[PDB]
Design a protein around this ligand. Structure first.
Ligand SMILES: Nc1ncnc2c1ncn2[C@@H]1O[C@H](COP(=O)(O)OP(=O)(O)O)[C@@H](O)[C@H]1O
Ligand SMILES: Nc1ncnc2c1ncn2[C@@H]1O[C@H](COP(=O)(O)OP(=O)(O)O)[C@@H](O)[C@H]1O
Ligand SMILES: Nc1ncnc2c1ncn2[C@@H]1O[C@H](COP(=O)(O)OP(=O)(O)O)[C@@H](O)[C@H]1O
Ligand SMILES: Nc1ncnc2c1ncn2[C@@H]1O[C@H](COP(=O)(O)OP(=O)(O)O)[C@@H](O)[C@H]1O
Ligand SMILES: [Zn+2]
Ligand SMILES: [Zn+2]
Lengths: 231, 244, 613, 635, 156
């Protein structure tokens, strides 16, 4: 059990992988000594900080709590490189540098990774802002390495493939808690990509019920749930 | 909390609140409400120093919700009633209501007329022999993608005073109709209403109706036609009214 | 007290003014004395009219209807004194002397604003006498409760009694007794408890839920818990549309203790039920109604009049409504000497096209029956139809609660969408159709439950529309074993027409043009035909009064028709089915014999049901 | 605090009436006081159960009325409060205890030696140079028997008709006992011994709970005020055989739309173990409440349970000369076939097979001796009526549905699961009638092989593995998946039964709903002829006698005949003939298991004719019945 | 364990807890008369690693139709995490017996089916139950470095 205090509340999410840097304390409880038979002390981690473990983080060069954060000099360099003519071609050619060719693939991935603008018209109409990209190709054309690069690159990135992705493994599900036996929602794969990228590998071989349960997230950008007394 | 204002990647958090005296029985579940009140702390029977928070309600306001629990009661103000009578005396209010539905959707004029007919609805009639006839109309938009059917569903959910928006994939037989749940403290079964109970007296909207399961489609037949859900489960038998 | 004695003499003056209550108390006492001491016992209760007490003393009427805790026990004391002064019995029993129940009050009359509903019972009506209406649910087990203990001391040889008070028993609040028997007397040394002279009353908790037709938009029905006094115990079964008159009272510390410093829980609220009214499932029969029934029974086409009197809004299905009429007045049941249970309850399965008004006939036989329970294909469970085992709150003991199919005993079950049960529910339903009793062997409980009930059910074919290809397998998706227990398999086809279609169209436009009486035009709703209460009185009269018996002039016709129908989906059970029609038509004629006109109508109806005529 | 009232019942005069009735009354209507003789038998240790009859008390007060004096209505005082009158009668018996007239056997009684040493203590301490509770010395258990044919105890009541006003009164209930617990000892006097003073103390128990004594309250132990620790002794304690069972309301007594209620019956003393589960009984007992102790009594308050302390239990339920009368009647096979289930017509051979199911076959020291029969017929030809009827003639048999099996269930009187017997358990040494053999569970589809083969119910649940006893003959009823029978449909394909089941199984009978005009008439006037008059019709034949079969089949089970060797040679030749027919559509061939079945049918008819040899014409008629089964396989 | 008195801040250290968490009774300051309310010193006290592994007999020595009997084995000190579940393994050490800790009157725990021993002052009127456990001191189980220098160092 990990204690979150002050700003650290609501930072972590259910299913989110984190690196907690915290003080490892111990306290006396009577239940462990009751059910164990030996003078055993419970252990409690008081968290001092939480770092999101985004991507593989095999690179140890990004030293900081948030890898996608910036300083003021980094913002100055962003404003410097944004005014260069041809920055679009630089971003496209720099997107997945380990893959040769495939200019349409890299352009579509850049468009999906940056995305458009969601629009609200008068509080009455909603326009989806994100861009969904399908890569149909022969095997041995490095379609999945681009997906792994987007996993490394995007701010939030969720992966799914094949029969291993259920209809409610995506979207969101409901479940009965062991305490009080109440029906509570559980966030799916698309809940963990609320401002990010969901990536599906081997899309055709996935079941139709599992393929196409994601219409409302990919069109209305929303998950409407009506089950077990929960709407 | 409001789904438009949820934080990124999280779940909407349920918060327990209380009303006293004449603030009680003012809201139907499913409405959108603005509430003013004090944020107090009460100790609960369920770690260290954890005292659960609540809000003691001092004031309830909701333009979408009217007349508290429904009694067919006229609480509209007199000058607004005169303005509404002026709208009913308009020679071309039909085109006004047609253009009011989906101003950002081109075409689909007959769909907009059917939507206005759905929102106004028919008249419920009672016969001396107990014959109850339907006073609502159910509209199914079947067609190609890119015809903005789901945008019409969302706008119907916005315009209607009592409305819920559901899925075909995200639905269930106990989810649309009323469900049988168990109370934790008493260990007794009780019926908690579903999506067609929260939409009683109003509009239920279903998206991707072609895809909802064959056991899931057919729990709706009495709720569409007979305007009731007859449930006999877990020792509880009842006929709830669902005028959706 | 002085004010207590003053209200005692005021209620004594009221009972002196109206001498009908004295006559009723005298009648109860002489009936008990004649049926108990000499060669089914009238209890200690009187029917107090609020209206008759209103013209006597409006202060006492307002005291009863506003603050009944200080007004009902003085009237109890005055009525007990009048019953003691009226009783003149020699040589009484010791248990009769020691254990006397005081004469309780049961209230009738108009209540005005106090006549309420379980949803609108609110905190301003606490400690007030209210009348509520709703469904009985979750009846607790009948369990005795001690209110007076009588002990004997042999060293002194004297009997000492101690009175025991509860929050639910007494309207006034007394200091609670911890229900410990006195081990020893202060002067009489050892004390021995003498059961039999001690006073025990039956205690029962019911739950009055709001009537679901009066539920508002978007809200579930609410419920209250009602204590039943020992006279009113077992008057109510679950599913009863009861009207309970009682004092809406709150009890308990309710979180005001020092342990519950900031818990926001409320107080536990109950109703101490003064009286219980059925609200007339078995309607009383005046002699004018009997004269009308026996006058119309002599007509030759009383079957036709009572058939088209059922649901005039529904056009067509005339033979189906005839079968519905013979279903409500189901045939006689015969129990043989060897123990074979021969079913007298005719059951009907209606399969066919959409919008042929099968579910509307289900709603009509729901409304017009004495006891009717509805169920749906996807809204039912097999355990939820027969019985479910659950704990009880006031006992801490496991017990059964009856499901849908058992609570409708001596009644009808209105099954809609029968073609799409889960197989688990199909097992239980088929078990009732072949056995009429359900055997529950679980939770340490080995019980059998009787269900002698009729079944009307509606179904669609396995296709979207019914085929005219007369395929036996595509009639229903259920197995033919469940088809066999249904006596009348009616099939309906919505064949597309012009003249009859125009007749149905004009009939339903005449149906929509009806305006209910006493209501304004254009506002929201808030050849002889007999009335439907008169039809229910006819059905009730035929059910309890006449038991027909079977006679040979129908029998030769029945065996000739069976040989014609079978030898030229037929079953031997069809023979019993003819009997389940034939004496049922005798229940139309009210005669105790069955004649040829019953058997010919039975053969015609079964030929319509099977061949289509 | 405790105010006092007056009641018009005198306990001293009633005690005088009881102690005069014990020495005065004698029953000369049957042809010295008989109750004094019973107390003499108590003093001679002949009997342990003393039954006071209220009819004897009513006749005694009627005799007092004949003498001219008047009693104090003793039987009404018994019926109002029997709990105090039980102890009053016990003290009246102890006041009039006769001297023993035989050998005492003083070495067996430890309490006599203890009370001898305590009287030595009392004479030594009070030399100066009650002692025991009365329930300790009581070796008799007192019971009450209600009056009959002479009044509330005489009238039998249902469980629902028992109200709160019937507490303290002797009542009578009719009901089926659901659960009977094991016989457990309940204490009445606890003996504690002091290790220092060497004395004892007795503490009486009249509740569900009791508290022990820590320190001795003896005069010698407290005079020097030594703090001796008391030790409980089970040797000198007074015990009673207590058993708690649950009685259920009969379904005829239950109103329409209600669930039957259960009541607790506690039996004590010599009335233990007479109660049996599944038995409809009349129980006359004292209706007493059961109070709690401590926190449960404080929280539940005035709301108190109840139980029944049973006083009397009544069961609701030459032979060879009648057997010889049935012999001289003639045609025992046809009479016992047509007499069984008189609501059906015809179908003689399958009805004879239903009889021979009840007859059964012989065993060998092991080969099973059970015959098993199936009705592999069309729907609507009265299957369940035959199953219910063949349950009603033969006792120790239950109707069951395959929608079946035995399993130990939880939520018992104890927290552990009790081995509640299923349908196969209670049908042991009898007949189990399984309806809808097509519609049955896969677990039962496993279980039927162990039922037929090893005749046991092997259940392993919650770490408990046990083998319950099911020595059961099986009737099966199996409709096919399609109702109609056609030669285009194979029999095994139509019935969809596995081949191993029919390989184990002996005799299938297929009757079909074939429309024949005269046959439908002869069935039709019979079916409506049970509907003409009251109950069973006239049989237009030798009439039925439902009581007569159950002893004749018991005698048939009693003979167990043994057959000769030349008849066995004819059986071998007939088996060779049926294997030659198996060389010759129904695939079903003759097996060695069918030969054992043929043998079972052979000694079944040897049992019916009460014969010592199996006759040759009996064997060929049995193989004719096998040919009838072959005709059923064809049609 | 080391504890401090809440009255006079006196220090009692080297309190040994056999099977339940125990506090000192007598304050070592003769001026102070404290008996209860002792505060634990988390930093000063010395702790050891604990692991409770549950074992059963192997399938070779299981007789016909028997559920396997179980035994709790305590690993302390260096021997923690040495034994992984599902392995044939040999523990050598001490057979010990453990009491019911709840029956000894542990602080903050209510007293909690076989009848055991009683008549103790810490028990009061309650009884004490015993379980067979094991205190193993050495474990064996009877059921990477991709560089040249460390591999030649690890080589014979
Ligand atoms: N420019 C490139 N074009 C095609 N394949 C490449 C390129 N660069 C690397 N690869 C190879 O593609 C492989 C990954 O292919 P993958 O995406 O798994 O195939 P698929 O598209 O069938 O899933 C890698 O092992 C890598 O060696
Ligand atoms: N007539 C239109 N006016 C404006 N937007 C439209 C129109 N037709 C289609 N669209 C756009 O195309 C999308 C169509 O989605 P929609 O057809 O509602 O999904 P579904 O196929 O699930 O019904 C919407 O997001 C909408 O913004
Ligand atoms: N006179 C009539 N003739 C035919 N149909 C009618 C008539 N009156 C009402 N109906 C229709 O019958 C319908 C009810 O049948 P339905 O609900 O389809 O039964 P089920 O639910 O069993 O299929 C109603 O919608 C009503 O419009
Ligand atoms: N003498 C008789 N001959 C044939 N059938 C009869 C006779 N008497 C009654 N029956 C009918 O047989 C039916 C029993 O059905 P049953 O054989 O149990 O059906 P299933 O074979 O589908 O289980 C009863 O409903 C009854 O109407
Ligand atoms: Zn002593
Ligand atoms: Zn100190």
């Amino acid at each position: 059990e990990v204690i979150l205090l002050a700003d650290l509340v609501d930072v972590s999410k259910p299913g989110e992988e984190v690196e907690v840097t915290g003080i490892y304390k111990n306290n006396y409880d009577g239940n462990l000594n009751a059910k164990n038979g030996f003078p055993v002390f419970a252990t409690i981690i008081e968290a001092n900080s939480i770092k999101r473990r985004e991507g593989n983080t095999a690179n140890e060069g990004e030293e900081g709590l948030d890898v996608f954060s910036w300083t003021e000099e980094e913002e100055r360099e962003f404003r410097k490189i944004s005014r260069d003519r041809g920055i679009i071609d630089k971003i496209i050619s720099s997107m997945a540098p380990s893959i040769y060719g495939h200019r349409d693939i890299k352009t579509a991935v850049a468009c999906s990774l940056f995305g458009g603008v969601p629009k609200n018209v008068n509080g009455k109409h909603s326009i989806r802002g994100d861009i969904n990209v399908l890569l149909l190709g022969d095997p041995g054309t490095a379609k999945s390495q681009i997906l792994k690069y987007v996993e490394k690159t995007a701010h939030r990135a969720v992966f799914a493939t094949g029969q291993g992705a259920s209809a409610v493994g995506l979207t969101a599900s409901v479940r009965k808690d062991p305490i009080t036996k109440e029906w509570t929602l559980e966030g799916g794969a698309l809940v963990l990509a609320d401002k990010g990228v969901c990536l599906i590998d081997e899309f055709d071989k996935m079941n139709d019920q599992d393929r196409t349960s994601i219409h409302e997230a990919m069109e209305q950008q929303s998950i409407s749930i009506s089950k077990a007394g929960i709407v | 909390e409001i789904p438009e204002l949820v934080p990124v990647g999280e779940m909407p958090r349920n918060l327990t609140m209380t009303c006293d005296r004449y603030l009680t029985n003012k809201v139907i579940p499913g409405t959108r409400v603005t509430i003013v009140g004090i944020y107090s702390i009460y100790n609960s029977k369920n770690g260290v120093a954890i005292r659960t928070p609540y809000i003691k309600i001092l004031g309830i306001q909701s333009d979408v919700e009217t007349s508290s629990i429904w009694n067919s009661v006229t609480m509209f103000t007199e000058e607004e009633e005169e303005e509404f009578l002026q709208l009913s005396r308009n020679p071309k209010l039909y085109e006004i209501l047609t253009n009011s539905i989906a101003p950002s959707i081109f075409g689909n004029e007959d769909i907009k007329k059917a939507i206005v007919c759905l929102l106004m609805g028919g008249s419920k009639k009672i016969l001396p022999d107990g014959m109850r006839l339907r006073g609502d109309i159910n509209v199914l938009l079947l067609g190609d993608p890119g015809t903005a059917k789901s945008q019409l569903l969302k706008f119907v959910e916005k315009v209607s005073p009592i409305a819920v928006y559901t899925s075909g994939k995200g639905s269930s037989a106990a989810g649309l109709t009323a469900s049988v749940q168990r109370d934790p403290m008493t260990r007794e079964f009780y019926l908690e209403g579903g999506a067609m109970v929260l939409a009683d007296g109003g509009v239920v909207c279903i998206d991707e109706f072609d895809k909802m399961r064959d056991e899931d489609r057919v729990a709706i037949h009495e709720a569409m036609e007979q305007q009731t859900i007859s449930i006999a489960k877990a020792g509880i038998t009842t006929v709830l009214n669902s005028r959706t | 007290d002085a004010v207590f004695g003053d209200r005692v003499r005021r209620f004594q003056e009221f009972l002196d003014t109206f001498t009908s209550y004295r006559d009723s108390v005298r009648s109860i006492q002489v009936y008990n004395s004649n049926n108990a001491a000499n060669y089914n016992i009238l209890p200690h209760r009187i029917i107090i009219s609020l209206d008759d007490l209103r013209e006597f003393d409006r202060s006492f009427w307002s005291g009863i209807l506003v603050e009944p805790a200080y007004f009902i026990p003085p009237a109890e004391k005055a009525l007990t004194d009048l019953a003691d002064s009226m009783d003149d019995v020699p040589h009484p029993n010791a248990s009769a002397v020691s254990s006397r129940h005081p004469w309780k009050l049961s209230f009738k009359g108009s209540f005005g604003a106090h006549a309420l509903s379980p949803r609108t019972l609110t905190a301003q009506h606490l400690n007030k006498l209210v009348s509520v209406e709703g469904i009985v649910t979750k009846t607790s087990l009948v369990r005795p409760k001690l209110i007076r203990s009588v002990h004997y001391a042999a060293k002194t040889g004297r009997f000492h009694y101690r009175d025991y008070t509860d929050a639910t028993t007494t309207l006034t609040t007394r200091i609670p007794t911890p229900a410990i028997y006195p081990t020893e007397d202060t002067e009489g040394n050892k004390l021995t408890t003498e059961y039999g002279y001690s006073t025990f009353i039956d205690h029962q908790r019911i739950t009055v839920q709001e009537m679901p037709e009066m539920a508002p938009a978007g809200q579930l029905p609410r419920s209250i818990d009602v204590i039943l006094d020992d006279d009113l115990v077992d008057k109510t079964k679950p599913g009863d549309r009861v009207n309970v008159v009682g004092v809406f009272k709150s009890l308990g510390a309710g979180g005001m203790n020092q342990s519950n410093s900031n818990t926001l829980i409320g107080f536990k609220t109950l109703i101490l039920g003064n009286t219980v009214y059925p609200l007339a499932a078995r309607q009383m029969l005046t002699d004018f109604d009997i004269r009308n029934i026996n006058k119309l029974s002599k007509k030759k086409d009383i079957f036709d009049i009572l058939s088209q009197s059922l649901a005039p809004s529904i056009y067509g299905h005339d033979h189906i409504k005839k079968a519905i009429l013979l279903m409500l007045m189901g045939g006689v049941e015969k129990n043989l000497e060897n123990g074979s249970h021969l079913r007298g309850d005719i059951n009907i399965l209606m399969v066919g096209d959409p919008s042929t008004a099968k579910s509307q006939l289900l709603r009509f036989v729901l409304n017009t029956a004495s006891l009717a329970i509805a169920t749906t294909g996807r809204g039912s469970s097999g355990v939820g139809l027969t019985a479910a085992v659950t704990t009880d709150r006031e006992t801490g003991e496991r017990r059964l609660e009856a499901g849908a199919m058992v609570l409708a005993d001596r009644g009808v079950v209105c099954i809609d969408e029968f073609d799409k049960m889960t197989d688990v529910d199909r097992v239980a339903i088929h078990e009732v159709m072949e056995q009429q009793t359900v055997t529950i062997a679980k939770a340490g409980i080995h019980t059998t439950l009787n269900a002698r009930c009729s079944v009307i059910a509606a179904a669609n074919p396995v296709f979207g529309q019914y085929d005219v290809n007369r395929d036996p397998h595509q009639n229903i998706a259920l197995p033919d074993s469940l088809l066999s227990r249904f006596d009348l398999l009616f099939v309906v086809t919505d064949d597309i027409n012009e003249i009859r279609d125009r007749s149905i169209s004009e009939h339903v436009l005449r149906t929509h043009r009806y305006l209910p009486p006493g209501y304004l035009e254009g506002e929201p709703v808030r050849p002889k035909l007999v009335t439907i209460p008169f039809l229910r009185k006819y059905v009730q009269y035929a059910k309890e009064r006449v038991i027909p018996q079977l006679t040979q002039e129908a029998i030769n016709v029945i065996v000739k028709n069976y040989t014609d129908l079978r030898n030229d989906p037929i079953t031997a059970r069809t023979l019993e089915t003819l009997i389940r029609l034939a004496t049922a038509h005798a229940k139309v004629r009210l005669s105790k014999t069955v004649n040829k006109v019953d058997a010919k109508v039975a053969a015609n109806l079964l030929r319509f049901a099977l061949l289509g005529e | 605090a405790l105010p006092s009232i007056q009641l018009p019942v005198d306990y001293n005069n009633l005690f005088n009436e009881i102690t005069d009735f014990l020495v005065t009354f004698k029953q000369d209507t049957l042809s010295g006081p008989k109750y004094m003789a019973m107390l003499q038998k108590v003093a001679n240790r002949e009997l342990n159960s003393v039954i006071i009859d209220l009819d004897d008390i009513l006749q005694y007060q009627n005799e007092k009325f004949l003498q001219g004096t008047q009693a104090d209505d003793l039987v009404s005082a018994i019926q109002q409060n029997a709990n105090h009158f039980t102890e009053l009668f016990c003290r009246a018996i102890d006041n009039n205890m006769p001297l023993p007239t035989k050998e005492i056997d003083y070495k067996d009684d430890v309490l006599d030696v203890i009370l001898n040493q305590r009287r030595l203590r009392n004479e030594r301490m009070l030399s100066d140079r009650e002692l025991f509770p009365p329930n300790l010395t009581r070796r008799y258990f007192l019971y009450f028997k209600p009056l009959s044919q002479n009044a509330i105890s005489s009238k039998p009541l249902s469980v629902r008709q028992i109200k709160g006003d019937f507490l303290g009164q002797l009542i009578t209930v009719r009901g089926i006992i659901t659960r009977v617990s094991d016989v457990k000892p309940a204490v009445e006097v606890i003996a504690y011994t002091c290790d220092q003073c060497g004395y004892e103390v007795f503490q009486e128990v009249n509740s569900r709970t009791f508290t022990p004594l820590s320190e001795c309250t003896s005069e010698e132990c407290s005079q020097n005020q030594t703090k001796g620790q008391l030790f409980m002794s089970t040797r000198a304690s007074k015990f009673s055989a207590f058993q708690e069972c649950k009685i259920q309301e009969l379904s005829q007594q239950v109103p329409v739309g209600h669930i039957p209620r259960s009541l607790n019956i506690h039996v004590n003393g010599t009335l233990v173990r007479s109660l049996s589960p599944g038995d409809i009984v009349d129980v006359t007992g004292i209706f007493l409440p059961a109070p709690y102790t401590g926190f449960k009594a404080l929280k539940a308050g005035l709301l108190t349970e109840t139980y029944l302390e049973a006083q009397f239990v009544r069961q609701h339920k030459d032979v060879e000369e009648r057997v010889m009368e049935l012999i001289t009647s003639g045609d025992v096979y046809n009479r016992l076939a047509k007499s069984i289930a008189p609501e059906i017509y015809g179908n003689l051979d399958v009805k004879k097979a239903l009889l021979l199911l009840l007859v059964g076959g012989v065993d060998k020291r092991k080969i099973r001796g059970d015959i098993n029969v199936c009705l592999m017929g069309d729907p609507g030809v009265a299957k369940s009526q035959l199953l219910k009827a063949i349950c009603k003639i033969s006792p120790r048999g239950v109707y069951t549905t395959g929608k079946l099996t035995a399993a130990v269930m939880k939520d018992p009187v104890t927290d552990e699961m009790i081995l509640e017997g299923g349908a196969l358990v209670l049908a042991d040494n009898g007949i189990c009638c399984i309806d809808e053999f097509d519609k049955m569970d896969e677990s039962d589809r496993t279980a039927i092989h162990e039922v037929m083969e090893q005749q046991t119910i092997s259940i392993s649940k919650a770490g408990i593995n046990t083998t319950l006893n099911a020595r059961t003959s099986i009737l099966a009823a199996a409709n096919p998946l399609y109702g109609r029978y056609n030669p285009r449909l194979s029999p095994l394909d139509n019935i969809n039964l596995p081949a191993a089941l029919l390989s184990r199984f002996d005799i299938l009978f297929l009757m079909l709903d074939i429309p024949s005009r005269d046959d439908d008439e002869k069935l039709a006037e019979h079916v409506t002829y049970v509907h003409m008059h009251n109950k069973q019709p006239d049989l237009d034949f030798t009439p039925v006698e439902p009581s007569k079969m159950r002893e004749y089949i018991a005698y048939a089970k009693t003979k167990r005949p043994v057959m000769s060797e030349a008849v066995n040679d004819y059986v071998v030749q007939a088996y060779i003939r049926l294997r030659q027919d198996s060389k010759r559509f129904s695939f079903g061939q003759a097996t060695p298991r069918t030969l054992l079945g043929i043998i079972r049918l052979s000694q079944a008819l040897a049992k019916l004719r009460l014969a010592d040899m199996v006759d040759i014409d009996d064997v060929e008629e049995a193989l004719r019945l096998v040919r009838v089964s072959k005709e059923s396989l064809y049609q | 364990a080391s504890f401090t008195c809440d009255m006079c801040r006196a220090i009692v250290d080297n309190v040994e807890q056999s099977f339940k968490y125990t506090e000192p009774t007598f304050c070592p300051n003769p001026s102070c008369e404290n008996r209860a309310f002792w505060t634990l010193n988390v930093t000063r006290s010395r702790f050891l690693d604990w692991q409770k592994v549950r074992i059963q007999e192997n399938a070779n020595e299981i007789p016909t139709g028997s559920m396997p009997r179980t035994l709790d084995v305590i690993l302390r000190g260096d021997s923690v995490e040495r034994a992984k579940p599902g392995d044939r393994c040999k523990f050598t050490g001490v057979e010990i017996v453990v009491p019911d800790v709840t029956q000894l009157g542990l602080p903050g725990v209510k007293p909690s089916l076989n009848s055991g021993v009683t008549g103790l002052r810490s028990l009061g009127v309650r009884d004490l139950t015993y379980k067979i456990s094991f205190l193993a001191c050495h474990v064996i189980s009877i059921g990477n470095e991709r560089d040249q220098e460390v591999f030649l160092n690890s080589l014979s």
